[PDB]
Write a protein that binds this ligand. Structure first.
Ligand SMILES: *C(=O)c1cnc2ccccc2n1
Ligand SMILES: *C(=O)c1cnc2ccccc2n1
Ligand SMILES: [Mg+2]
Ligand SMILES: [Mg+2]
Ligand SMILES: [Mg+2]
Ligand SMILES: [Mg+2]
Lengths: 8, 10
DNA sequence: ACGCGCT
DNA sequence: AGCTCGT
């Protein structure tokens, strides 16, 4: 849920 | 939602 | 180094 | 109650 590297 | 961004719902 | 979106 | 990625 976070998008800090993936943003899922 | 989704997942992600389940469903809705379930 | 970070948790997200309605039925 | 119901889930998911790496830049
Ligand atoms: C989004 O909040 C989120 C939280 N945890 C995870 C774990 C593994 C892959 C993706 C994820 N996304
Ligand atoms: C984005 O690819 C990414 C990778 N590793 C992490 C570890 C801890 C917090 C955030 C991260 N983001
Ligand atoms: Mg976590
Ligand atoms: Mg929330
Ligand atoms: Mg509830
Ligand atoms: Mg990882």
């Amino acid at each position: 849920x976070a998008x800090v590297x993936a943003x899922v | 939602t989704x997942p992600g961004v389940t469903x809705p719902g379930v």
